[PDB]
Amino acid sequence: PVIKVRENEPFDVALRRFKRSCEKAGVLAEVRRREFYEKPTTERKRAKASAVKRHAKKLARENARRTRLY
Amino acid sequence: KFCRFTAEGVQEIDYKDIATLKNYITESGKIVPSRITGTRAKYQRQLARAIKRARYLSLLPYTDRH
Amino acid sequence: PRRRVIGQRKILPDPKFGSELLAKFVNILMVDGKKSTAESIVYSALETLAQRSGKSELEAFEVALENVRPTVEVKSRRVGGSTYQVPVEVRPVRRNALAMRWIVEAARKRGDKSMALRLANELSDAAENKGTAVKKREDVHRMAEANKAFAHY
Amino acid sequence: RKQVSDGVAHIHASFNNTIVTITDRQGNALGWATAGGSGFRGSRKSTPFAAQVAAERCADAVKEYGIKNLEVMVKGPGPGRESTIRALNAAGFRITNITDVTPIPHGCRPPKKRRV
RNA sequence: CUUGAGUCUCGUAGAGGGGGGUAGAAUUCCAGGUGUAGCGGUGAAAUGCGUAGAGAUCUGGAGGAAUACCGGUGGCGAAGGCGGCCCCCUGGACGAAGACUGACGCUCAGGUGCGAAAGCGUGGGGAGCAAACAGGAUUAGAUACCCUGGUAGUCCACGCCGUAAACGAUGUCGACUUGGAGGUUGUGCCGGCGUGGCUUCCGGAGCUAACGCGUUAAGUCGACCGCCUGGGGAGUACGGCCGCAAGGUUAAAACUCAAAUGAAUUGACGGGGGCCCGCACAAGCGGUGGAGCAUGUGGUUUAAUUCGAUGCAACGCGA
Ligand SMILES: [Mg+2]
Ligand SMILES: [Mg+2]
Ligand SMILES: [Mg+2]
Ligand SMILES: [Mg+2]
Ligand SMILES: [Mg+2]
Ligand SMILES: [Mg+2]
Numbered sequence: 001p002v003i004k005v006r007e008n009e010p011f012d013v014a015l016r017r018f019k020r021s022c023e024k025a026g027v028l029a030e031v032r033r034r035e036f037y038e039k040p041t042t043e044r045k046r047a048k049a050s051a052v053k054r055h056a057k058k059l060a061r062e063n064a065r066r067t068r069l070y
Numbered sequence: 071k072f073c074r075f076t077a078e079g080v081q082e083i084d085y086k087d088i089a090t091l092k093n094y095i096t097e098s099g100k101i102v103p104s105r106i107t108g109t110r111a112k113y114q115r116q117l118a119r120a121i122k123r124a125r126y127l128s129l130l131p132y133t134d135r136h
Numbered sequence: 137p138r139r140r141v142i143g144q145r146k147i148l149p150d151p152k153f154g155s156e157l158l159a160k161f162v163n164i165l166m167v168d169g170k171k172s173t174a175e176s177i178v179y180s181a182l183e184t185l186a187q188r189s190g191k192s193e194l195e196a197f198e199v200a201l202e203n204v205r206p207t208v209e210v211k212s213r214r215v216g217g218s219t220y221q222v223p224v225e226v227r228p229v230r231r232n233a234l235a236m237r238w239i240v241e242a243a244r245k246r247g248d249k250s251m252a253l254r255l256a257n258e259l260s261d262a263a264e265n266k267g268t269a270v271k272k273r274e275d276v277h278r279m280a281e282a283n284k285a286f287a288h289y
Numbered sequence: 290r291k292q293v294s295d296g297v298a299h300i301h302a303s304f305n306n307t308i309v310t311i312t313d314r315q316g317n318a319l320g321w322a323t324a325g326g327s328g329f330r331g332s333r334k335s336t337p338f339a340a341q342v343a344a345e346r347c348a349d350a351v352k353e354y355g356i357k358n359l360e361v362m363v364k365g366p367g368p369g370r371e372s373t374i375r376a377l378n379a380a381g382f383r384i385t386n387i388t389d390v391t392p393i394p395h396g397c398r399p400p401k402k403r404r405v
Numbered sequence: 406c407u408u409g410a411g412u413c414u415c416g417u418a419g420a421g422g423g424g425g426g427u428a429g430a431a432u433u434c435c436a437g438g439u440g441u442a443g444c445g446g447u448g449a450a451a452u453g454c455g456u457a458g459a460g461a462u463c464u465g466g467a468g469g470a471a472u473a474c475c476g477g478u479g480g481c482g483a484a485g486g487c488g489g490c491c492c493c494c495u496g497g498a499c500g501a502a503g504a505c506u507g508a509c510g511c512u513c514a515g516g517u518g519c520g521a522a523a524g525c526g527u528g529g530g531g532a533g534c535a536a537a538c539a540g541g542a543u544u545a546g547a548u549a550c551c552c553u554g555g556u557a558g559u560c561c562a563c564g565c566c567g568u569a570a571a572c573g574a575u576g577u578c579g580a581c582u583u584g585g586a587g588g589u590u591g592u593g594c595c596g597g598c599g600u601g602g603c604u605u606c607c608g609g610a611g612c613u614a615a616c617g618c619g620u621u622a623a624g625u626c627g628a629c630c631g632c633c634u635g636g637g638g639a640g641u642a643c644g645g646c647c648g649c650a651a652g653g654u655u656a657a658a659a660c661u662c663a664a665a666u667g668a669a670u671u672g673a674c675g676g677g678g679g680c681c682c683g684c685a686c687a688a689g690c691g692g693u694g695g696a697g698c699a700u701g702u703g704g705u706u707u708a709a710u711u712c713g714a715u716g717c718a719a720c721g722c723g724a
């Protein structure tokens with residue numbers, strides 16, 4: 001994430017652009033993910049479980065919209 | 071969305087087409103997921119292949135920190 | 137508490153100077169519900185404090201408070217077994233209360249004879265940063281500044 | 290003794306400590322400061338505040354070189370990634386580029402997960 | 406005879422396999438520059454590294470291993486498994502139009518082959534990680550968890566081993582029986598309408614002890630095979646076979662118990678989650694615990710020291 005400070009751009013919005021620039025490539029996220037060895041049996045387990053919850057939230061959000069709470 | 075390769079009737083994405091390829095790599099050179107560019111899975115696999123040919127030939131970079 | 141149904145209680149201004157700030161000082165000094173006994177101690181010391189600095193009754197009492205009022209204090213919060221001291225700003229009402237308590241507890245532990253004399257000496261040493269009431273304001277500040285790195289939850 | 294006026298600040302912000310190295314443009318270090326060497330140990334060392342202080346000290350250390358324009362390279366996952374940058378700008382330098390240079394393998398096996 | 410089975414022609418997708426080559430990021434080490442006092446690690450520390458110049462930063466080199474992003478309840482494979490890019494050799498699947506053979510099919514005890522990881526043998530290699538091991542902590546102890554190191558091993562070639570929660574805990578083949586939402590890969594016609602293969606989720610009848618399965622069945626049937634017969638003893642002993650070994654495989658009995666078990670229900674509990682409350686904490690004031698005395702209790706003593714209450718909820722209690 002290379003950021004160049006432009007003319008008439010204060011520090012705060014230049015630093016903030018660096019926040020967004022790093023978050024977009026997520027350089028902090030893979031840094032945590034590589035900090036410890038994760039077995040192939042658990043990365044398949046987390047990937048599978050992550051998909052299940054993402055599907056499970058879709059069905060829950062869909063079925064709620066036909067249900068009234070009051 | 072709108073996979074642009076199905077609309078233009080392409081058959082091979084042609085790694086030598088760096089002008090097209092650069093629309094599918096991030097500012098850091100990372101390939102952009104097809105959830106974002108709306109590319110069909112079939113062409114995304116050719117696109118990801120073609121980007122790796124270009125990176126070997128130094129037509130595209132691996133990263134922005136070379 | 138959990139509910140927060142707390143409303144403040146109206147405190148009468150003192151009989152002499154009509155200062156509600158001094159009225160709370162007497163209450164802090166008061167022991168065993170003897171308000172009349174404590175008013176005599178407060179007034180006698182203020183009669184001495186005024187004539188010893190020539191300033192006044194009330195703003196000779198005020199200048200001693202400004203040297204004992206704390207600006208930031210530490211609250212313990214436990215995270216992982218080891219306690220973290222978290223500095224926090226003191227709200228204005230508590231700052232007057234804290235200065236008043238440190239003055240009174242300082243005078244009770246003195247070698248002067250009469251509590252009126254014990255307080256009169258202690259208020260004066262607060263005026264030029266010599267007393268043990270001012271000492272604790274420094275200690276509270278050093279502790280808060282020592283833990284300045286923890287200024288977040 | 291030497292004047293440069295254009296340098297690079299390398300921030301090494303890990304989970305445990307932050308190290309601020311101010312170099313010239315060629316990679317020759319001029320001065321450095323660390324959170325651990327700035328009066329902080331243990332829990333206080335890994336805080337964003339400790340990074341800011343270590344940034345001021347390095348700016349206080351390399352003041353005999355007359356740097357005005359500064360590039361910034363941020364390396365590591367530490368909490369001192371952001372506070373260090375702000376403390377350099379507040380110190381009085383002109384921040385030209387803010388680059389994250391954290392090493393990412395495209396490599397070696399990481400250590401095992403901690404069972405705590 | 407052509408509908409099952411297969412052959413041919415055109416093409417499609419694919420981490421299918423085997424051999425070779427090469428790329429970039431990072432780690433580590435080696436040399437050198439700049440530079441100065443810490444670094445590292447933890448809940449916190451210490452071991453450890455560092456003034457013999459570390460860590461940070463930069464330049465050059467060596468080396469090994471794995472291939473970020475793409476990446477997807479995506480794909481391929483009988484299963485185990487398979488992931489940078491390129492070439493070579495090679496296997497299978499699928500689709501569209503026909504042509505061709507003419508039941509050539511299905512299943513399969515014994516037999517043969519493949520079969521994660523660990524392990525074994527021989528010869529290499531060795532960056533990172535890491536059994537064993539060493540030290541530092543933690544602790545009542547700590548032969549652990551955590552930290553600092555670290556050897557076999559992990560990598561390659563060849564050969565053995567032949568086991569895994571080798572799992573979909575679901576043998577293989579074939580036929581039939583409402584729907585919906587997807588993904589992936591072909592293909593005919595004009596984004597729409599079909600038609601195939603594979604795959605994910607929800608659910609109907611039906612089935613099931615229930616949970617659930619539900620056109621990819623655990624539904625309705627047919628063909629063949631494997632296996633089970635209460636728990637423990639025990640997948641153990643002995644024998645045979647196999648292996649260099651570690652061990653694998655086949656596989657008991659005496660004896661012992663009256664249960665062991667599966668699913669679901671109501672509670673209770675959790676060092677599970679969420680949301681609330683209370684002098685529960687926090688914010689404060691005054692106490693108790695020290696002293697003397699009052700009083701109750703325990704113990705001891707006594708001829709008797711009446712009996713009772715004796716965690717909170719007995720102890721200035723019945724009194
Ligand atoms: Mg570690
Ligand atoms: Mg053939
Ligand atoms: Mg068969
Ligand atoms: Mg057999
Ligand atoms: Mg192996
Ligand atoms: Mg070996």
Ligand SMILES: [Mg+2]
Pocket residue numbers: none
């Ligand atoms: Mg060997």
Ligand SMILES: [Mg+2]
Pocket residue numbers: none
């Ligand atoms: Mg270890």
Ligand SMILES: [Mg+2]
Pocket residue numbers: none
């Ligand atoms: Mg078995």
Ligand SMILES: [Mg+2]
Pocket residue numbers: 571
């Ligand atoms: Mg398996």
Ligand SMILES: [Mg+2]
Pocket residue numbers: 572
């Ligand atoms: Mg499985």
Ligand SMILES: [Mg+2]
Pocket residue numbers: none
């Ligand atoms: Mg089985």
Ligand SMILES: [Mg+2]
Pocket residue numbers: 608619
């Ligand atoms: Mg279902």
Ligand SMILES: [Mg+2]
Pocket residue numbers: none
């Ligand atoms: Mg045996």
Ligand SMILES: [Mg+2]
Pocket residue numbers: none
């Ligand atoms: Mg045997």
Ligand SMILES: [Mg+2]
Pocket residue numbers: 687
């Ligand atoms: Mg309290």
Ligand SMILES: [Mg+2]
Pocket residue numbers: none
């Ligand atoms: Mg007592």
Ligand SMILES: [Mg+2]
Pocket residue numbers: none
């Ligand atoms: Mg009694």
Ligand SMILES: [Mg+2]
Pocket residue numbers: none
């Ligand atoms: Mg009785």
Ligand SMILES: [Mg+2]
Pocket residue numbers: none
């Ligand atoms: Mg009794």
